Ligand binder design. Structure first.
Ligand SMILES: [Cu+2]
Length: 123
């Protein structure tokens, strides 16, 4: 199945967001990132994707289709706006083994604040 995500300058949670920011999927699904506003892209964060998954980075303003294979949690960012909180959590399969690790990992405060909301207020 396919899940569409919009990359925006302003959305329900504030400035620079992915909508939705919480994506549930299964091995084999695709996630399509659509740059509704310009200046955005998607990139996997180091140490924040499952063991065995390949890292990825799309070009700015391009539509990007990510195929997810490995189960686990993935924290992705917009390269340009990571420090402004622009992230999404993907979640492949049930009880992703690396979720608690990603929540504990070092990252900007604003990012941590949004992650915590997406896990609570979206689960
Ligand atoms: Cu961005």
């Amino acid at each position: 199945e396919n899940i569409e995500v919009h990359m925006l300058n302003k959305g329900a949670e504030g400035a620079m967001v992915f909508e939705p920011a919480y994506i549930k999927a299964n091995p084999g699904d695709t996630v399509t990132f659509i740059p509704v506003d310009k200046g955005h892209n998607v990139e996997s964060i180091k140490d924040m994707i499952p063991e065995g998954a390949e890292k990825f980075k799309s070009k700015i303003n391009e539509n990007y289709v990510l195929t997810v294979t490995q189960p686990g949690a993935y924290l992705v960012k917009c390269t340009a706006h990571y420090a402004m909180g622009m992230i999404a959590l993907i979640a492949v399969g049930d009880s992703p083994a690396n979720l608690d690790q990603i929540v504990s990992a070092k990252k900007p405060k604003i990012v941590q604040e949004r992650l915590e909301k997406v896990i609570a207020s979206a689960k």
